[PDB]
Design a protein around this motif. Structure first.
Motif, PDB file in Angstrom:
ATOM      1  N   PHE A 198       0.830  -1.191   0.000  1.00 52.75           N
ATOM      2  CA  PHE A 198       0.000   0.000   0.000  1.00 52.75           C
ATOM      3  C   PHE A 198       0.878   1.260   0.000  1.00 52.75           C
ATOM      4  O   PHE A 198       1.719   1.446   0.880  1.00 52.75           O
ATOM      5  CB  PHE A 198      -0.885  -0.016   1.253  1.00 52.75           C
ATOM      6  N   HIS A 199       0.661   2.145  -0.989  1.00 53.70           N
ATOM      7  CA  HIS A 199       1.391   3.386  -1.133  1.00 53.70           C
ATOM      8  C   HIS A 199       0.445   4.564  -1.286  1.00 53.70           C
ATOM      9  O   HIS A 199      -0.464   4.500  -2.124  1.00 53.70           O
ATOM     10  CB  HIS A 199       2.245   3.293  -2.413  1.00 53.70           C
ATOM     11  N   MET A 200       0.725   5.674  -0.592  1.00 57.54           N
ATOM     12  CA  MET A 200       0.013   6.916  -0.881  1.00 57.54           C
ATOM     13  C   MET A 200       1.002   7.993  -1.348  1.00 57.54           C
ATOM     14  O   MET A 200       2.013   8.222  -0.706  1.00 57.54           O
ATOM     15  CB  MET A 200      -0.694   7.559   0.316  1.00 57.54           C
ATOM     16  N   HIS A 201       0.688   8.684  -2.449  1.00 58.57           N
ATOM     17  CA  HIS A 201       1.444   9.854  -2.879  1.00 58.57           C
ATOM     18  C   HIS A 201       1.145  11.038  -1.957  1.00 58.57           C
ATOM     19  O   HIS A 201       0.022  11.221  -1.477  1.00 58.57           O
ATOM     20  CB  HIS A 201       1.122  10.277  -4.325  1.00 58.57           C
ATOM     21  N   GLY A 202       2.203  11.807  -1.648  1.00 55.83           N
ATOM     22  CA  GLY A 202       2.091  13.098  -0.990  1.00 55.83           C
ATOM     23  C   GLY A 202       1.904  13.076   0.516  1.00 55.83           C
ATOM     24  O   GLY A 202       1.763  14.148   1.135  1.00 55.83           O
ATOM     25  N   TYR A 251      -3.289   6.777  -4.635  1.00 55.32           N
ATOM     26  CA  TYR A 251      -2.953   5.686  -3.723  1.00 55.32           C
ATOM     27  C   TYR A 251      -3.090   4.455  -4.586  1.00 55.32           C
ATOM     28  O   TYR A 251      -3.880   4.440  -5.539  1.00 55.32           O
ATOM     29  CB  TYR A 251      -3.781   5.639  -2.429  1.00 55.32           C
ATOM     30  N   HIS A 252      -2.253   3.465  -4.302  1.00 62.85           N
ATOM     31  CA  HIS A 252      -2.246   2.259  -5.103  1.00 62.85           C
ATOM     32  C   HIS A 252      -1.425   1.179  -4.420  1.00 62.85           C
ATOM     33  O   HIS A 252      -0.617   1.438  -3.544  1.00 62.85           O
ATOM     34  CB  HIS A 252      -1.723   2.497  -6.518  1.00 62.85           C
ATOM     35  N   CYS A 253      -1.618  -0.037  -4.903  1.00 64.68           N
ATOM     36  CA  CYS A 253      -0.698  -1.100  -4.628  1.00 64.68           C
ATOM     37  C   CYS A 253       0.528  -0.809  -5.469  1.00 64.68           C
ATOM     38  O   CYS A 253       0.373  -0.498  -6.635  1.00 64.68           O
ATOM     39  CB  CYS A 253      -1.261  -2.462  -5.020  1.00 64.68           C
ATOM     40  N   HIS A 254       1.727  -0.979  -4.930  1.00 71.15           N
ATOM     41  CA  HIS A 254       2.925  -0.596  -5.665  1.00 71.15           C
ATOM     42  C   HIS A 254       3.581  -1.806  -6.312  1.00 71.15           C
ATOM     43  O   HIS A 254       4.577  -1.649  -7.009  1.00 71.15           O
ATOM     44  CB  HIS A 254       3.922   0.146  -4.765  1.00 71.15           C
ATOM     45  N   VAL A 255       3.039  -3.002  -6.085  1.00 72.64           N
ATOM     46  CA  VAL A 255       3.420  -4.136  -6.925  1.00 72.64           C
ATOM     47  C   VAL A 255       3.095  -3.794  -8.374  1.00 72.64           C
ATOM     48  O   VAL A 255       1.986  -3.436  -8.681  1.00 72.64           O
ATOM     49  CB  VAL A 255       2.666  -5.408  -6.513  1.00 72.64           C
TER      50      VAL A 255
ATOM     51  N   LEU B  66      10.610  11.638 -12.603  1.00 75.47           N
ATOM     52  CA  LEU B  66      11.162  11.429 -11.285  1.00 75.47           C
ATOM     53  C   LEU B  66      10.048  11.574 -10.250  1.00 75.47           C
ATOM     54  O   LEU B  66       9.461  12.663 -10.098  1.00 75.47           O
ATOM     55  CB  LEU B  66      12.202  12.539 -11.140  1.00 75.47           C
ATOM     56  N   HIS B  67       9.763  10.462  -9.564  1.00 72.83           N
ATOM     57  CA  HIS B  67       8.836  10.432  -8.443  1.00 72.83           C
ATOM     58  C   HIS B  67       9.635  10.082  -7.207  1.00 72.83           C
ATOM     59  O   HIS B  67      10.431   9.156  -7.244  1.00 72.83           O
ATOM     60  CB  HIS B  67       7.749   9.362  -8.671  1.00 72.83           C
ATOM     61  N   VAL B  68       9.325  10.712  -6.086  1.00 72.57           N
ATOM     62  CA  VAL B  68      10.001  10.432  -4.849  1.00 72.57           C
ATOM     63  C   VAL B  68       8.995   9.995  -3.785  1.00 72.57           C
ATOM     64  O   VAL B  68       7.876  10.493  -3.764  1.00 72.57           O
ATOM     65  CB  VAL B  68      10.798  11.696  -4.428  1.00 72.57           C
ATOM     66  N   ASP B 122      11.328   6.309 -11.695  1.00 72.39           N
ATOM     67  CA  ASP B 122      10.499   6.745 -12.800  1.00 72.39           C
ATOM     68  C   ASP B 122       9.042   6.305 -12.594  1.00 72.39           C
ATOM     69  O   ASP B 122       8.767   5.260 -12.005  1.00 72.39           O
ATOM     70  CB  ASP B 122      11.056   6.234 -14.113  1.00 72.39           C
ATOM     71  N   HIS B 123       8.125   7.088 -13.169  1.00 69.87           N
ATOM     72  CA  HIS B 123       6.704   6.798 -13.093  1.00 69.87           C
ATOM     73  C   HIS B 123       5.999   6.730 -14.456  1.00 69.87           C
ATOM     74  O   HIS B 123       4.791   6.548 -14.462  1.00 69.87           O
ATOM     75  CB  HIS B 123       6.054   7.855 -12.185  1.00 69.87           C
ATOM     76  N   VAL B 124       6.699   6.793 -15.599  1.00 74.42           N
ATOM     77  CA  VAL B 124       5.982   6.826 -16.874  1.00 74.42           C
ATOM     78  C   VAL B 124       6.624   6.004 -17.976  1.00 74.42           C
ATOM     79  O   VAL B 124       6.013   5.902 -19.034  1.00 74.42           O
ATOM     80  CB  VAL B 124       5.788   8.255 -17.430  1.00 74.42           C
ATOM     81  N   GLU B 128       2.121   3.812 -16.914  1.00 75.76           N
ATOM     82  CA  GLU B 128       1.932   5.012 -16.130  1.00 75.76           C
ATOM     83  C   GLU B 128       2.232   4.765 -14.662  1.00 75.76           C
ATOM     84  O   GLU B 128       2.026   5.678 -13.852  1.00 75.76           O
ATOM     85  CB  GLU B 128       0.478   5.461 -16.210  1.00 75.76           C
ATOM     86  N   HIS B 129       2.721   3.575 -14.302  1.00 75.92           N
ATOM     87  CA  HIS B 129       3.298   3.393 -12.968  1.00 75.92           C
ATOM     88  C   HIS B 129       4.812   3.166 -13.015  1.00 75.92           C
ATOM     89  O   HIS B 129       5.432   2.771 -12.018  1.00 75.92           O
ATOM     90  CB  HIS B 129       2.574   2.230 -12.277  1.00 75.92           C
ATOM     91  N   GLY B 130       5.367   3.303 -14.211  1.00 83.01           N
ATOM     92  CA  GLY B 130       6.796   3.320 -14.417  1.00 83.01           C
ATOM     93  C   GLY B 130       7.360   1.910 -14.454  1.00 83.01           C
ATOM     94  O   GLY B 130       8.533   1.732 -14.221  1.00 83.01           O
TER      95      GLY B 130
HETATM   96 RU   LIG Z   1       3.059   5.549  -8.164  1.00 81.95          RU
END
Ligand SMILES: [Ru+3]
Ligand SMILES: [Cu+2]
Ligand SMILES: [Cu+2]
Ligand SMILES: [Cu+2]
Ligand SMILES: [Cu+2]
Ligand SMILES: [Cu+2]
Ligand SMILES: [Cu+2]
Ligand SMILES: [Ru+3]
Ligand SMILES: [Ru+3]
Lengths: 279, 279, 279
Positions: A198-202, A251-255, B66-68, B122-124, B128-130
């Motif tokens: 589980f990942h949330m941006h920001g 927000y998404h699963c990052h797998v 670039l996503h952090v 990377d994200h793209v 679109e999830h890199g």
């Molecule tokens: Ru992402």
């Protein structure tokens, strides 16, 4: 929490009705009222010390139950076939969940305390571990608050159930909405066959009981990404847009194949005017 | 940390250039200079309070970003196509990452703090999830130090990317080298499709923010083995050879088929004379 | 722990014999005596400060070793082929494991401490990561107690090894038995290829080093469900039937197909009269 709202001392007896129902599309859901079942099922929230008597009716044509994590229950409320704790088609049973506060035992040890982010689900549809019931949508969240816990503006439930979020079709959310500065609580539950991240941006939170730090001394990891597996539950609060501003925050699963195949949603954080930059 | 070196208070504005580049073998990497991209990409390290303006150029012929994780960024620096935060072939964009110190909010709650072991990617590229960008090597570490954090002699980055370490061929390391008594920091990041278990022989650390205990009261588990999934990041410090001496100390994924198929390297801890018993 | 029994200060040199042996059914196990090997292998328990000299004999016709997690060992006791630390058919070797207490280093930092729930296993049967040895049953638990740690009435070892518990056939347990109010310690180890989620009905523990909270300030999550992967180890104590009473309390992997296919057992908590409601 000084002047944020905080949970009071618990200790009340509460009563509630729940139903399990088949839905028109073939899923199965819990609800507090017939015809209003949802997936996930409705949130149950209590304070440590509370007792909850749930008058449960199975309106389906197959046996079903209610099993809970975390809370105190006797064996007669474990929700299993083995302990004769499930419910026949059309039947009713009262399940009892209790909770307790932490405190010192006679031996000088410290007894933990019920508080946490927990969940309930079926244990007998499809298999005696509830695999079909869980797949079909018989799951929901439970929150037990400790006295002094910080309370949120709103609570959202996100369940990674196999390769769905909340049993939705790929790439259909759910999306949640907030305004910059709202205190948002997330209850995050996983079910099924697969591990997830589980990942949330920001946004980010503390990997501990409440998802928040009381002060400078807590050494818990601060994270934005967390591995989970079946029947795991955690929760946290974030201040929407804190330090980052408004936006359509994913927000998404990052797998990688999971996000690619649709385990994605949006946390829509609005300015006061209701707009979202970039959206 | 009393007389070990410790991080100072942060608060500076910093500037840096980064490039994404295709490499001759078909991978893709980040670098601070053209022609010097690496996989993993270079370490970025800041103090809480710092702001970092990254002047990013995509030298590739496909879009990239670039996503952090962890750090504060506005939606315009999320690195996604959705928020128009990616970069066309040959283009340049300034990404801004901010960090903040922990402290008391007006409501009496405690705001967490940016410090931790984080990562960028990377994200793209590819999706679109890199997914393609990550697969090809567009990832790197970020460390945010809190004032008073203990600083190491050296920092090594270990990324479990699918069934590789740092995109290397099976059984080719990487190997890292130290002398008995060095303070070595490890940044451990996972990407891709699979869960893993990171294990180090001869050494152990605390499962908390810093990987170290400040004193006798921290109840965190001390471990030598840790499950991780895609986009997880943690870090720690160990004293090389502390209590165990010199040696070719293996590190590996402990999932049995993964170690068998090459997710193995060596932590070569030398005596002062540069030798290693058994090697 | 005030008047519960607590571990004393460690510091003794101890000696022990171990054997690796093939069993009649084709498994392989460790034991303190020939003809009495078990899977899992016997529990080794020491206090921080203790040294343990294990006189190990490989009675098998293939090479075998002993590798341990957590504890201090020199490279000559890592149990690997690489460091010439394995044992030929019929051979004997003395492995040494040391442990240390936590304390302040000269630089003012705090050195962790050996205490925890750990494990030992083979590293050279079938592959040089011990994949065949682990599969066949060469694994066992190790507990290192810190001075002041609470001691249990009894300790049970549960190993999720691939799709078995303790190398048993599906749906054959193991089952453990207690009386309401007993202090039961669980050592939970995972091996092999797969991730799992360990769940216990009716009981819960703290996600920290000891599985227990010393007092009201520990912010650790209280859980009843925990993701694990290969070579992970944790442990906890629970008071049997605390707040929930007697019953046949299931424990299982909560990955749905795993419980369905047999990764289930029973924690049989009895009243004083020896009966179990619902069983
Ligand atoms: Ru992402
Ligand atoms: Cu997933
Ligand atoms: Cu469950
Ligand atoms: Cu792996
Ligand atoms: Cu990411
Ligand atoms: Cu399992
Ligand atoms: Cu191991
Ligand atoms: Ru169950
Ligand atoms: Ru190994």
């Amino acid at each position: 929490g000084i002047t944020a709202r905080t949970a009071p001392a618990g200790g009340e007896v509460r009563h509630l009705k729940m139903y399990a129902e088949k839905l028109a599309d073939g899923q199965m859901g819990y609800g507090f009222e017939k015809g209003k079942a949802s997936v996930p099922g409705p949130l149950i929230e209590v304070n440590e010390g509370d007792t909850l008597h749930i008058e449960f009716t199975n309106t389906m044509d197959v046996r079903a139950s209610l099993h809970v994590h975390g809370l105190d229950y006797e064996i007669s409320s474990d929700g299993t076939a083995m302990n004769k704790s499930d419910v026949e088609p059309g039947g009713t049973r009262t399940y009892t969940w209790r909770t307790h506060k932490p405190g010192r035992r006679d031996d000088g040890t410290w007894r933990p305390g019920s508080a946490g982010y927990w969940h309930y689900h079926d244990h007998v549809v499809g298999t005696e571990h509830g695999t079909g019931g869980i797949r079909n949508g018989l799951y929901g969240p439970v929150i037990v608050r400790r006295k002094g816990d910080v309370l949120p503006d709103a609570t959202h439930t996100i369940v990674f159930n196999d390769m769905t979020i909340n049993n939705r079709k790929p790439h259909t959310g759910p999306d949640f909405e907030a305004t910059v500065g709202d205190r948002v609580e997330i209850v995050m539950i996983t079910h099924g066959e697969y591990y997830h991240t589980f990942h949330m941006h920001g946004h980010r939170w503390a990997d501990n009981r409440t998802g928040i730090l009381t002060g400078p001394d807590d050494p818990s990891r601060v994270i934005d990404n967390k591995i989970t597996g079946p029947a795991d539950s955690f929760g946290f609060q974030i201040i929407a847009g804190e330090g980052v501003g408004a936006g359509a925050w994913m927000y998404h699963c990052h797998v990688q194949s999971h996000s690619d195949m649709g385990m994605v949603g949006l946390f829509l954080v609005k300015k006061p005017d209701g707009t979202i930059p970039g959206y």
